[PDB]
Amino acid sequence: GAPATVTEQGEDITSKKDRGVLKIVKRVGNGEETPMIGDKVYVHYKGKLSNGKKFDSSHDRNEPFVFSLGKGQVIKAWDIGVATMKKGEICHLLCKPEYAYGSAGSLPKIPSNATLFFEIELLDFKGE
Numbered sequence: 001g002a003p004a005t006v007t008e009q010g011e012d013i014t015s016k017k018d019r020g021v022l023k024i025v026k027r028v029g030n031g032e033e034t035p036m037i038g039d040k041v042y043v044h045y046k047g048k049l050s051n052g053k054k055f056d057s058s059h060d061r062n063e064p065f066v067f068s069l070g071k072g073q074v075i076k077a078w079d080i081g082v083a084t085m086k087k088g089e090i091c092h093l094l095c096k097p098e099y100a101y102g103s104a105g106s107l108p109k110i111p112s113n114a115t116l117f118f119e120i121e122l123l124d125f126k127g128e
């Protein structure tokens, strides 16, 4: 399914090229710009563990999800992945634990050593 497709087809967007964050573009965005470090970004997303059954979405909570890019407000895979996206783009991201919650985990939602899968839609981004 979508996570295996990312394994097979995803672009490795890590600096180290360790296949820790793999991306597939599912919808091409608009324009040319991608967000800068410190930009306020606006997204919709859905996420899940690759193993077991825990699913999370911005769509429930009744609004875009906002954060400052590249400042450690979200897991490393997001800082890396969202920085690659154009406005309007949708991607799928497969995130190995080294770019997520690592050996520690974050319970109840996240076990130790968890690979995560996300669908992210970049709605907008603005310099702080």
Ligand SMILES: COc1ccc(CC[C@@H](OC(=O)[C@@H]2CCCCN2C(=O)[C@H](c2cc(OC)c(OC)c(OC)c2)[C@@H]2C=CCCC2)c2cccc(OCCN3CCOCC3)c2)cc1OC
Pocket (backbone or CB within 6 Å): 045, 047, 048, 049, 054, 055, 056, 066, 067, 068, 072, 073, 074, 075, 076, 078, 100, 101, 106, 109, 110, 116
């Ligand atoms: C620097 O490293 C970290 C930084 C931040 C965190 C916290 C978890 C982070 O969530 C995430 O980073 C990812 C990506 C963004 C969407 C949510 N994310 C998740 O993993 C989800 C998530 C949602 C959660 O709530 C909706 C979580 O509870 C806080 C949560 O806790 C671990 C994890 C999980 C993904 C798959 C299925 C289960 C849930 C998150 C969740 C909810 C809101 C967040 O930021 C809100 C905006 N902040 C608010 C504070 O001021 C700065 C801006 C960030 C852990 C960090 O490592 C310990």
